[PDB]
Design a protein around this ligand. Sequence first.
Ligand code: PKK
Ligand code: PKK
Lengths: 115, 115
Amino acid sequence: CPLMVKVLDAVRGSPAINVAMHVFRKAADDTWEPFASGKTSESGELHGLTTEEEFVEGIYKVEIDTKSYWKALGISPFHEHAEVVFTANDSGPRRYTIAALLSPYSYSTTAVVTN
Amino acid sequence: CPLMVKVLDAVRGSPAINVAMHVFRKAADDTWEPFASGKTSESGELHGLTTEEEFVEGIYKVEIDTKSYWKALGISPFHEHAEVVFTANDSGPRRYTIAALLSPYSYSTTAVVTN
Ligand SMILES: CCc1oc2cc(O)ccc2c1C(=O)c1cc(I)c(O)c(I)c1
Ligand SMILES: CCc1oc2cc(O)ccc2c1C(=O)c1cc(I)c(O)c(I)c1
């Protein structure tokens, strides 16, 4: 699993379940082409987005549909989405977890990059 | 001052000085148009980006150049930039402070919205 996304909810103290997201890879003309997408599981995790062979060096964007999540909970949110943009680099074997902790007017995102 | 951006450095415990950012506004054809830009001062704040009359309803994106900030301190960070996308002024004019707290592999962003 070269790339996994985990989303938590800071209002309810729980995984953020059924959060949709799309992953994009930056093309040579600086546009964003779709790469993978899915919705978080009951654990707040989205697995299986890509494979080692496909996940080459480049700039990637994860767009997490936080607005729909808060709307489904009846809570007014600030952001249209949470966007995480990063370069994937080959420095030995690397697995990436992109994590996001969500509140209606704030989010915190980190990366856990391991071998 | 309807739109202000404040950036802090979580490694040094200080304002993040000389951080460049660009603000965009979504046009009716759904492209991002340039709206304003600037860099943070010694206080970590960027004031004066827009005016009440120009800052109409719309979807705005603030792209904060966090990568250049960390690279100048010798650090190779995870993110290319921090992106903040939000609908503004949908219920009348408000004042927005966008805040970002930066670490090399993580950032937290919030908004303070006042009437
Ligand atoms: C210390 C855990 C943690 O704290 C945070 C605080 C934040 O503001 C934002 C994100 C996190 C975050 C995670 O990224 C996280 C949580 C779990 I549970 C995991 O299994 C994994 I992998 C990663
Ligand atoms: C970048 C600003 C900021 O972002 C954060 C994110 C967090 O998760 C926790 C705290 C902060 C935080 C601040 O400490 C802060 C905010 C304002 I508005 C200030 O006027 C002053 I002085 C300090």
